Amino acid sequence: GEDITSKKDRGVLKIVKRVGNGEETPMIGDKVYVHYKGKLSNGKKFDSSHDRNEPFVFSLGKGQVIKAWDIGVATMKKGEIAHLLIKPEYAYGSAGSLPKIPSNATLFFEIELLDFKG
Template sequence: MINDSNMDLINLTKDGNVTKRILREGVGVSPEKGNSVCVHYESFLQETNTKFDSTRDRKAEFTFNLNSGKVVEAWEVAIPTMKVGEKAEIFCSSEYGYGDEGRTHIVPRKANLRFEVELLGFWENANSAAERIALAEKKKLEGNQLFQTGLTEEALFAYRKARDYIKDLWNCEPEELEQSRLLIVTIQLNIAACYLRLKNYEFAIEVCKRALNRDCTNIKGYYRLALAYLELGEFDQCIEFVKLGLEYRPSNPELLALLSTAEKKKERWLKESKKIYRKMCDN
Protein backbone atom coordinates (compact mmCIF):
# COMPACT_ATOMS: atom_id res chain seq x y z
CA MET A 1 0.00 0.00 0.00
CA ILE A 2 1.14 3.56 -0.67
CA ASN A 3 -0.88 5.32 2.03
CA ASP A 4 -2.14 4.76 5.55
CA SER A 5 -4.44 1.74 5.77
CA ASN A 6 -8.01 2.77 6.57
CA MET A 7 -11.29 0.97 6.33
CA ASP A 8 -12.76 3.69 4.10
CA LEU A 9 -10.08 3.45 1.40
CA ILE A 10 -11.30 1.97 -1.89
CA ASN A 11 -8.78 0.00 -3.91
CA LEU A 12 -9.01 0.92 -7.61
CA THR A 13 -6.20 -1.17 -9.12
CA LYS A 14 -5.10 -4.79 -8.75
CA ASP A 15 -1.66 -3.76 -7.52
CA GLY A 16 -3.16 -1.52 -4.82
CA ASN A 17 -1.28 1.54 -6.02
CA VAL A 18 -4.32 3.71 -6.73
CA THR A 19 -6.82 4.15 -3.90
CA LYS A 20 -9.67 6.53 -3.18
CA ARG A 21 -11.36 7.88 -0.08
CA ILE A 22 -14.76 9.53 -0.58
CA LEU A 23 -14.97 12.81 1.33
CA ARG A 24 -18.44 13.72 0.04
CA GLU A 25 -20.87 11.49 -1.82
CA GLY A 26 -21.99 12.43 -5.32
CA VAL A 27 -25.21 11.84 -7.23
CA GLY A 28 -26.21 10.05 -10.43
CA VAL A 29 -24.04 8.30 -12.98
CA SER A 30 -20.28 8.43 -13.58
CA PRO A 31 -18.37 9.74 -16.62
CA GLU A 32 -17.19 7.34 -19.31
CA LYS A 33 -14.31 7.14 -21.76
CA GLY A 34 -14.33 10.09 -24.16
CA ASN A 35 -16.52 12.31 -21.97
CA SER A 36 -15.42 15.86 -21.24
CA VAL A 37 -14.92 16.25 -17.49
CA CYS A 38 -14.74 19.35 -15.31
CA VAL A 39 -13.09 19.26 -11.87
CA HIS A 40 -11.60 21.28 -9.07
CA TYR A 41 -8.49 19.73 -7.55
CA GLU A 42 -5.54 20.18 -5.23
CA SER A 43 -2.32 18.19 -5.67
CA PHE A 44 0.07 17.17 -2.88
CA LEU A 45 3.34 15.29 -2.45
CA GLN A 46 2.21 12.43 -0.26
CA GLU A 47 5.38 12.12 1.81
CA THR A 48 5.56 15.77 2.94
CA ASN A 49 1.93 16.84 2.27
CA THR A 50 3.33 19.72 0.20
CA LYS A 51 0.80 21.26 -2.18
CA PHE A 52 2.19 21.80 -5.67
CA ASP A 53 -0.90 22.63 -7.75
CA SER A 54 -4.47 23.84 -7.15
CA THR A 55 -7.34 25.01 -9.35
CA ARG A 56 -8.92 26.57 -6.26
CA ASP A 57 -5.88 28.77 -5.75
CA ARG A 58 -6.11 29.80 -9.42
CA LYS A 59 -9.89 30.18 -9.13
CA ALA A 60 -10.32 28.31 -12.40
CA GLU A 61 -11.92 24.92 -13.07
CA PHE A 62 -10.03 22.31 -15.09
CA THR A 63 -11.60 20.57 -18.09
CA PHE A 64 -10.21 17.59 -20.00
CA ASN A 65 -11.32 14.52 -21.97
CA LEU A 66 -11.07 11.14 -20.29
CA ASN A 67 -8.52 8.78 -21.87
CA SER A 68 -6.93 11.61 -23.85
CA GLY A 69 -3.53 11.33 -22.14
CA LYS A 70 -3.82 14.85 -20.72
CA VAL A 71 -3.77 13.83 -17.02
CA VAL A 72 -1.94 11.35 -14.79
CA GLU A 73 -2.99 7.72 -15.01
CA ALA A 74 -4.38 7.77 -11.46
CA TRP A 75 -7.04 10.24 -12.59
CA GLU A 76 -7.93 8.10 -15.61
CA VAL A 77 -8.51 5.24 -13.17
CA ALA A 78 -10.26 7.14 -10.38
CA ILE A 79 -12.49 9.75 -12.01
CA PRO A 80 -14.69 7.22 -13.87
CA THR A 81 -15.56 5.84 -10.42
CA MET A 82 -16.80 9.23 -9.21
CA LYS A 83 -20.28 10.75 -9.42
CA VAL A 84 -21.16 14.41 -9.97
CA GLY A 85 -20.71 16.37 -6.76
CA GLU A 86 -18.41 13.75 -5.28
CA LYS A 87 -15.26 14.96 -3.56
CA ALA A 88 -12.55 12.38 -3.02
CA GLU A 89 -8.94 11.90 -2.03
CA ILE A 90 -6.96 9.95 -4.63
CA PHE A 91 -3.66 8.34 -3.60
CA CYS A 92 -1.20 6.91 -6.11
CA SER A 93 2.33 5.62 -6.49
CA SER A 94 4.71 7.36 -8.85
CA GLU A 95 4.00 4.95 -11.71
CA TYR A 96 0.40 6.27 -11.81
CA GLY A 97 1.61 9.85 -11.31
CA TYR A 98 4.68 11.48 -12.83
CA GLY A 99 6.86 8.35 -12.95
CA ASP A 100 10.56 8.03 -12.34
CA GLU A 101 11.32 11.47 -13.77
CA GLY A 102 8.76 13.56 -11.86
CA ARG A 103 8.19 17.15 -12.99
CA THR A 104 11.15 19.49 -13.04
CA HIS A 105 11.25 21.80 -9.99
CA ILE A 106 7.73 20.68 -8.97
CA VAL A 107 7.42 16.94 -8.37
CA PRO A 108 10.48 14.90 -7.26
CA ARG A 109 11.52 11.66 -8.91
CA LYS A 110 9.43 8.60 -7.97
CA ALA A 111 7.07 10.69 -5.82
CA ASN A 112 3.85 9.23 -4.42
CA LEU A 113 0.98 11.68 -4.73
CA ARG A 114 -2.31 12.64 -3.12
CA PHE A 115 -5.06 14.57 -4.87
CA GLU A 116 -8.27 16.10 -3.57
CA VAL A 117 -10.65 16.09 -6.54
CA GLU A 118 -14.22 17.36 -6.84
CA LEU A 119 -16.18 16.25 -9.91
CA LEU A 120 -18.21 19.29 -10.99
CA GLY A 121 -19.72 17.70 -14.05
CA PHE A 122 -19.20 15.95 -17.36
CA TRP A 123 -20.79 15.89 -20.78
CA GLU A 124 -20.82 13.96 -24.03
CA ASN A 125 -20.20 15.13 -27.57
CA ALA A 126 -23.18 15.54 -29.88
CA ASN A 127 -23.54 16.17 -33.61
CA SER A 128 -27.09 16.05 -34.95
CA ALA A 129 -29.95 18.22 -33.70
CA ALA A 130 -31.71 15.15 -32.33
CA GLU A 131 -28.60 14.14 -30.34
CA ARG A 132 -28.17 17.66 -28.97
CA ILE A 133 -31.79 17.86 -27.85
CA ALA A 134 -31.63 14.41 -26.26
CA LEU A 135 -28.44 15.25 -24.37
CA ALA A 136 -29.84 18.61 -23.26
CA GLU A 137 -32.83 16.79 -21.80
CA LYS A 138 -30.52 14.28 -20.12
CA LYS A 139 -28.40 17.02 -18.50
CA LYS A 140 -31.54 18.86 -17.40
CA LEU A 141 -32.79 15.75 -15.59
CA GLU A 142 -29.35 15.32 -14.02
CA GLY A 143 -29.52 18.94 -12.85
CA ASN A 144 -32.96 18.32 -11.33
CA GLN A 145 -31.61 15.40 -9.31
CA LEU A 146 -28.64 17.43 -8.10
CA PHE A 147 -30.85 20.39 -7.18
CA GLN A 148 -33.23 18.19 -5.21
CA THR A 149 -30.34 16.78 -3.18
CA GLY A 150 -29.01 20.24 -2.33
CA LEU A 151 -26.01 20.23 -4.70
CA THR A 152 -26.89 23.62 -6.15
CA GLU A 153 -23.53 24.52 -7.73
CA GLU A 154 -23.38 21.12 -9.43
CA ALA A 155 -26.99 21.47 -10.59
CA LEU A 156 -26.16 24.87 -12.06
CA PHE A 157 -23.24 23.32 -13.94
CA ALA A 158 -25.52 20.60 -15.37
CA TYR A 159 -28.18 23.12 -16.45
CA ARG A 160 -25.58 25.32 -18.14
CA LYS A 161 -24.25 22.35 -20.07
CA ALA A 162 -27.81 21.41 -21.04
CA ARG A 163 -28.28 24.94 -22.35
CA ASP A 164 -24.98 24.81 -24.25
CA TYR A 165 -26.21 21.85 -26.32
CA ILE A 166 -29.13 23.78 -27.80
CA LYS A 167 -28.63 27.51 -27.29
CA ASP A 168 -27.41 28.00 -30.89
CA LEU A 169 -29.49 25.27 -32.50
CA TRP A 170 -31.15 26.51 -35.68
CA ASN A 171 -30.31 24.29 -38.70
CA CYS A 172 -32.91 21.62 -37.97
CA GLU A 173 -36.50 20.57 -38.58
CA PRO A 174 -39.28 22.97 -37.44
CA GLU A 175 -40.53 20.53 -34.78
CA GLU A 176 -36.98 20.18 -33.41
CA LEU A 177 -36.64 23.95 -33.30
CA GLU A 178 -39.86 24.26 -31.30
CA GLN A 179 -38.82 21.42 -28.99
CA SER A 180 -35.52 23.21 -28.43
CA ARG A 181 -37.25 26.52 -27.70
CA LEU A 182 -39.49 25.03 -25.05
CA LEU A 183 -36.64 23.06 -23.49
CA ILE A 184 -34.33 26.04 -23.24
CA VAL A 185 -37.07 28.05 -21.49
CA THR A 186 -37.33 25.32 -18.86
CA ILE A 187 -33.54 25.13 -18.51
CA GLN A 188 -33.21 28.91 -18.12
CA LEU A 189 -35.81 28.91 -15.36
CA ASN A 190 -34.02 26.04 -13.62
CA ILE A 191 -30.83 28.09 -13.79
CA ALA A 192 -32.78 30.96 -12.23
CA ALA A 193 -33.89 28.66 -9.40
CA CYS A 194 -30.23 27.88 -8.70
CA TYR A 195 -29.33 31.57 -8.67
CA LEU A 196 -32.21 32.29 -6.28
CA ARG A 197 -30.99 29.60 -3.89
CA LEU A 198 -27.44 30.99 -4.17
CA LYS A 199 -28.81 34.51 -3.51
CA ASN A 200 -27.44 35.74 -6.83
CA TYR A 201 -30.57 37.70 -7.62
CA GLU A 202 -29.20 39.85 -10.45
CA PHE A 203 -28.27 36.76 -12.48
CA ALA A 204 -31.66 35.22 -11.69
CA ILE A 205 -33.35 38.31 -13.12
CA GLU A 206 -31.24 38.13 -16.27
CA VAL A 207 -32.01 34.50 -17.10
CA CYS A 208 -35.73 34.87 -16.24
CA LYS A 209 -36.00 37.73 -18.70
CA ARG A 210 -34.28 35.63 -21.37
CA ALA A 211 -36.78 32.83 -20.74
CA LEU A 212 -39.75 35.21 -20.95
CA ASN A 213 -38.40 36.59 -24.22
CA ARG A 214 -38.86 33.08 -25.64
CA ASP A 215 -42.18 32.39 -23.87
CA CYS A 216 -44.01 35.45 -22.56
CA THR A 217 -46.79 33.29 -21.04
CA ASN A 218 -44.58 31.29 -18.68
CA ILE A 219 -45.90 31.71 -15.12
CA LYS A 220 -42.78 30.28 -13.45
CA GLY A 221 -40.79 32.91 -15.30
CA TYR A 222 -42.88 35.76 -13.86
CA TYR A 223 -42.86 34.21 -10.38
CA ARG A 224 -39.10 33.69 -10.19
CA LEU A 225 -38.38 37.08 -11.74
CA ALA A 226 -40.70 38.81 -9.27
CA LEU A 227 -39.22 36.84 -6.38
CA ALA A 228 -35.69 37.96 -7.30
CA TYR A 229 -36.84 41.59 -7.32
CA LEU A 230 -38.56 41.07 -3.95
CA GLU A 231 -35.34 39.70 -2.44
CA LEU A 232 -33.50 42.79 -3.69
CA GLY A 233 -36.10 45.00 -2.03
CA GLU A 234 -37.28 46.34 -5.39
CA PHE A 235 -40.96 46.12 -4.56
CA ASP A 236 -42.39 48.05 -7.50
CA GLN A 237 -40.62 45.83 -10.04
CA CYS A 238 -41.76 42.74 -8.13
CA ILE A 239 -45.38 43.89 -8.17
CA GLU A 240 -45.15 44.85 -11.84
CA PHE A 241 -44.04 41.39 -12.95
CA VAL A 242 -46.48 39.59 -10.66
CA LYS A 243 -49.30 41.55 -12.29
CA LEU A 244 -47.98 40.73 -15.76
CA GLY A 245 -48.11 37.04 -14.84
CA LEU A 246 -51.61 37.40 -13.43
CA GLU A 247 -52.78 38.67 -16.82
CA TYR A 248 -52.19 35.12 -18.08
CA ARG A 249 -53.29 33.26 -14.91
CA PRO A 250 -55.52 35.59 -12.82
CA SER A 251 -56.13 32.97 -10.11
CA ASN A 252 -52.60 31.56 -9.81
CA PRO A 253 -52.13 31.02 -6.04
CA GLU A 254 -48.32 31.44 -6.04
CA LEU A 255 -48.48 34.78 -7.84
CA LEU A 256 -51.34 36.02 -5.67
CA ALA A 257 -49.45 35.08 -2.50
CA LEU A 258 -46.32 36.80 -3.77
CA LEU A 259 -48.31 39.91 -4.65
CA SER A 260 -49.74 40.05 -1.12
CA THR A 261 -46.27 39.63 0.40
CA ALA A 262 -44.75 42.30 -1.83
CA GLU A 263 -47.50 44.82 -1.10
CA LYS A 264 -47.18 44.27 2.67
CA LYS A 265 -43.40 44.60 2.56
CA LYS A 266 -43.65 47.75 0.47
CA GLU A 267 -46.17 49.25 2.91
CA ARG A 268 -43.93 48.39 5.86
CA TRP A 269 -40.90 49.87 4.08
CA LEU A 270 -42.78 53.11 3.36
CA LYS A 271 -43.80 53.44 7.02
CA GLU A 272 -40.23 52.87 8.19
CA SER A 273 -38.93 55.37 5.64
CA LYS A 274 -41.37 58.02 6.89
CA LYS A 275 -40.29 57.43 10.49
CA ILE A 276 -36.63 57.84 9.54
CA TYR A 277 -37.45 61.01 7.59
CA ARG A 278 -39.33 62.51 10.55
CA LYS A 279 -36.42 61.77 12.89
CA MET A 280 -34.02 63.47 10.51
CA CYS A 281 -36.26 66.52 10.28
CA ASP A 282 -36.70 66.69 14.09
CA ASN A 283 -32.96 66.74 14.55
Protein backbone atom coordinates in the same frame (compact mmCIF):
# COMPACT_ATOMS: atom_id res chain seq x y z
CA GLY B 1 -8.38 3.61 0.82
CA GLU B 2 -9.94 1.23 -1.78
CA ASP B 3 -7.65 -0.05 -4.63
CA ILE B 4 -9.47 1.09 -7.85
CA THR B 5 -6.69 -0.16 -10.25
CA SER B 6 -7.40 -2.95 -12.82
CA LYS B 7 -3.96 -4.48 -11.89
CA LYS B 8 -4.95 -4.42 -8.14
CA ASP B 9 -1.39 -3.06 -7.51
CA ARG B 10 -2.56 -0.54 -4.82
CA GLY B 11 -1.25 2.21 -7.21
CA VAL B 12 -4.41 4.36 -6.80
CA LEU B 13 -6.19 4.22 -3.39
CA LYS B 14 -9.56 6.05 -3.20
CA ILE B 15 -11.36 7.47 -0.10
CA VAL B 16 -14.81 9.05 -0.76
CA LYS B 17 -14.76 12.39 1.20
CA ARG B 18 -18.24 13.48 -0.01
CA VAL B 19 -20.80 11.07 -1.55
CA GLY B 20 -22.11 12.54 -4.84
CA ASN B 21 -25.71 13.60 -5.63
CA GLY B 22 -25.66 12.19 -9.21
CA GLU B 23 -26.25 8.57 -10.37
CA GLU B 24 -24.03 8.91 -13.52
CA THR B 25 -20.27 8.18 -13.78
CA PRO B 26 -18.52 9.78 -16.81
CA MET B 27 -17.65 7.72 -19.94
CA ILE B 28 -14.26 7.56 -21.74
CA GLY B 29 -14.06 10.62 -24.07
CA ASP B 30 -16.43 12.72 -21.88
CA LYS B 31 -15.43 16.33 -21.12
CA VAL B 32 -15.13 16.43 -17.28
CA TYR B 33 -15.15 19.59 -15.09
CA VAL B 34 -13.41 19.31 -11.68
CA HIS B 35 -12.05 21.33 -8.78
CA TYR B 36 -8.91 19.80 -7.23
CA LYS B 37 -6.18 20.15 -4.61
CA GLY B 38 -2.88 18.31 -5.27
CA LYS B 39 0.30 17.87 -3.22
CA LEU B 40 3.34 15.59 -2.83
CA SER B 41 2.44 13.09 0.00
CA ASN B 42 5.23 14.80 2.11
CA GLY B 43 3.63 18.25 1.29
CA LYS B 44 6.72 19.97 -0.29
CA LYS B 45 4.57 21.31 -3.23
CA PHE B 46 0.86 22.25 -3.59
CA ASP B 47 -1.49 23.20 -6.47
CA SER B 48 -5.28 23.87 -6.59
CA SER B 49 -7.86 24.87 -9.27
CA HIS B 50 -9.07 27.21 -6.44
CA ASP B 51 -5.70 29.13 -6.71
CA ARG B 52 -6.99 30.36 -10.15
CA ASN B 53 -10.76 30.06 -9.22
CA GLU B 54 -11.08 28.12 -12.54
CA PRO B 55 -12.51 24.58 -12.90
CA PHE B 56 -10.00 22.15 -14.50
CA VAL B 57 -11.45 20.65 -17.75
CA PHE B 58 -10.09 17.55 -19.57
CA SER B 59 -11.17 14.61 -21.81
CA LEU B 60 -11.52 11.45 -19.66
CA GLY B 61 -9.16 8.59 -20.68
CA LYS B 62 -7.15 10.63 -23.31
CA GLY B 63 -3.91 10.57 -21.22
CA GLN B 64 -4.19 14.42 -21.03
CA VAL B 65 -3.55 13.98 -17.25
CA ILE B 66 -1.65 11.46 -15.09
CA LYS B 67 -3.01 7.86 -15.21
CA ALA B 68 -4.38 8.13 -11.62
CA TRP B 69 -6.80 10.93 -12.77
CA ASP B 70 -8.14 8.94 -15.80
CA ILE B 71 -8.62 5.89 -13.46
CA GLY B 72 -9.93 7.91 -10.44
CA VAL B 73 -12.34 10.36 -12.13
CA ALA B 74 -13.83 7.42 -14.14
CA THR B 75 -15.15 6.04 -10.76
CA MET B 76 -16.76 9.32 -9.56
CA LYS B 77 -20.40 10.60 -9.53
CA LYS B 78 -21.44 14.29 -10.00
CA GLY B 79 -20.95 16.12 -6.64
CA GLU B 80 -18.53 13.41 -5.38
CA ILE B 81 -15.30 14.48 -3.63
CA ALA B 82 -12.60 11.76 -3.68
CA HIS B 83 -9.16 11.62 -2.00
CA LEU B 84 -6.62 9.70 -4.17
CA LEU B 85 -3.29 8.38 -2.84
CA ILE B 86 -1.20 7.78 -5.99
CA LYS B 87 2.01 5.68 -6.27
CA PRO B 88 4.65 6.81 -8.82
CA GLU B 89 3.51 4.30 -11.56
CA TYR B 90 0.20 6.29 -11.84
CA ALA B 91 1.86 9.77 -11.66
CA TYR B 92 5.45 10.82 -12.64
CA GLY B 93 7.13 7.41 -12.12
CA SER B 94 10.90 6.89 -11.59
CA ALA B 95 11.62 9.71 -14.13
CA GLY B 96 9.77 12.31 -12.03
CA SER B 97 9.18 15.82 -13.49
CA LEU B 98 11.85 18.10 -11.97
CA PRO B 99 11.84 20.72 -10.80
CA LYS B 100 8.17 20.26 -9.61
CA ILE B 101 8.01 16.46 -8.97
CA PRO B 102 10.92 14.27 -7.75
CA SER B 103 11.52 10.66 -8.89
CA ASN B 104 9.20 8.04 -7.26
CA ALA B 105 6.97 10.64 -5.53
CA THR B 106 3.62 9.57 -4.00
CA LEU B 107 0.93 12.21 -4.83
CA PHE B 108 -2.26 13.09 -2.96
CA PHE B 109 -5.28 14.73 -4.65
CA GLU B 110 -8.69 15.89 -3.55
CA ILE B 111 -10.95 15.96 -6.65
CA GLU B 112 -14.51 17.36 -6.82
CA LEU B 113 -16.44 16.18 -9.93
CA LEU B 114 -18.66 19.20 -10.86
CA ASP B 115 -20.18 17.95 -14.15
CA PHE B 116 -19.38 16.26 -17.50
CA LYS B 117 -20.73 16.05 -21.11
CA GLY B 118 -20.44 13.33 -23.85
